[PDB]
Amino acid sequence: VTDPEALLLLPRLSIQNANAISSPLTWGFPSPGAFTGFVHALQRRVGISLDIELDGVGIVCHRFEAQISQPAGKRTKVFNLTRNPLNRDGSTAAIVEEGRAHLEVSLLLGVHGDGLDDHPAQEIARQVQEQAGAMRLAGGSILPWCNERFPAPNAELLMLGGSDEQRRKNQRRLTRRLLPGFALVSREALLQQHLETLRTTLPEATTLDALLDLCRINFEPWQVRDKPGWLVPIPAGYNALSPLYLPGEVRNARDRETPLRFVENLFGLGEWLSPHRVAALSDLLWYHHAEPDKGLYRWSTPRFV
């Protein structure tokens, strides 16, 4: 990973049908790996012509509306589906369960390369905003934002462009532009602390995460025990099962010039903070970390704590 030379703020992005299913176990907000893959794809489309390497992305989540329904007579929830066409003779197909959610999230990503010196001072942000619109973020199209009252412009702020009080003033002015939302950060050390204090001659299997995910009203002589903040299980990358295959070896591949690996998910913690208690907006940025010989294709926010 590396440190950004500038931060690019894409404003309030509206996604119509995102993938609310983010794991084999967690539903709700999409995986942040979708956002990191979006910024990598946006680097492949528009980052090469400007000579900018685009890594690290923030997630602020202005609003979230999941297309779910609670059935009358049950506590749990089910998904509102869409209907599929007929197969071959006239017959209703087998329905595939896909969760959909309307999202509004603005992004802050890390401009890192050597493409801005003094001349294209604001054109880089506008070109990245005009290329981000005709793409997808979690499987759903980004809304075009037709004319209602007034648009929402892009932003490009250079953290090296100014003194220390200029850094704090520009960070305070930027962090007010994403204020109705909640930033998502990754907390691996906190989950390891909970595993340390919990494992007192009793072994864990997965209870360290489902115990922070539940709400217990247990009694210590009711009372309901509480935590600071909102701690949600999020899919933190993949893990390897298969010894890796040659590009032209596995049949029914997506392409025969990239090696295939059968992978499983991973699960870690995440917190939904405010934009004004992180002490640096150069954090919140979600990066990859491969280590390809072992597996552990992970994504996380480094340099946080």
Partner: protein
Amino acid sequence: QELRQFIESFIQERLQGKLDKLHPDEDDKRQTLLATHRREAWLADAARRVGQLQLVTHTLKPIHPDARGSNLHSLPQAPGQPGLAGSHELGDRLVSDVVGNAAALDVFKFLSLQYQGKNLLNWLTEDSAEAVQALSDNAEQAREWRQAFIGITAVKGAPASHSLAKQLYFPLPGSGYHLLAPLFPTSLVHHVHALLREARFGDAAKAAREARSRQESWPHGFSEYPNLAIQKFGGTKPQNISQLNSERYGENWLLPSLPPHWQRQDQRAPIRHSSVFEHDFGRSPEVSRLTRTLQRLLAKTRHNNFTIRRYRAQLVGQICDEALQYAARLRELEPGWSATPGCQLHDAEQLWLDPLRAQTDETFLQRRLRGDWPAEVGNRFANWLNRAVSSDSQILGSPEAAQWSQELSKELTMFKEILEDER
């Protein structure tokens, strides 16, 4: 050879149900049910019947059920990097999922016939007396049927993902990509669902809920697991996907990763009430459980101060966070909601809540909003937050109230500092 009586029981209990679920009145069809499904030609066809694989954490049928790729049996390698967990690389061992044809699952039901354990019978590598129980006529076809049963439960074929499974690129550090085709971890989704079923419908939860209905003590407590969701893989018959998808019919039992404010849509303007901290702030949906927990926490013991003072400080930090977000989201209603003639003027708090009103009334508000410096609006907030304390002389007499005033004054100083540069 004591397995043989247990064997000939099961074929009879199968064939009786096959005769009963036919509604027979004519056509003399039952004779073949006496011919094949009573003798051991059933065993020859059970040796013939394949499609089953005995997987653990790899199914491709939950992702678009008309897709035939590769299904695996391997626990993932134990990671040394701390912070996460993705499989059951620990205790509470696997449940041995099997994917195959739905007509062939009677063979697995015969393998899992728990004659002193189904692990030494489904993976029957260590059998000594069971061989002649499989065929009490010879020793050749007995070994043949043993090899045909235990050999087909570990076989692969070829790696595939039949154009409807998922496979997504992963950017490498320097340059390059890996293809990264994932699978559904049915043993892990079985184990999580079994824990969530044990925490609610179990005996311990039934015992410890009866004590709470009666306000008691008891050895221990319990949990709730809110906002679960159901994702039903099989449409009407779940036997096509997996046997574990039939034991947990549909029933993915997913856990919530939602934002905090997700089910909190409300659009209102405080045109009626004068003071906005006392009214419509406590009437907000999320602030009430912060304030009531603060009243619950501001009357307690101060012996273990290192954790409870941190929790008491973070619970006030969240309150001023929601206080700033309220003014942040009230700028989406209208540029001005105070220019109309109203019974309550309330400009002292509405100068904070109507910033674009100065863009409309650019004559007097442009001088007055930048000449008056509204920074006592946090002092009005502190008078509302002082009612979150309990009226007890024991906490009022000690010095911990000075500590509470110290942390509240620090966080309100940060609040006033943020509110000063609002122009």
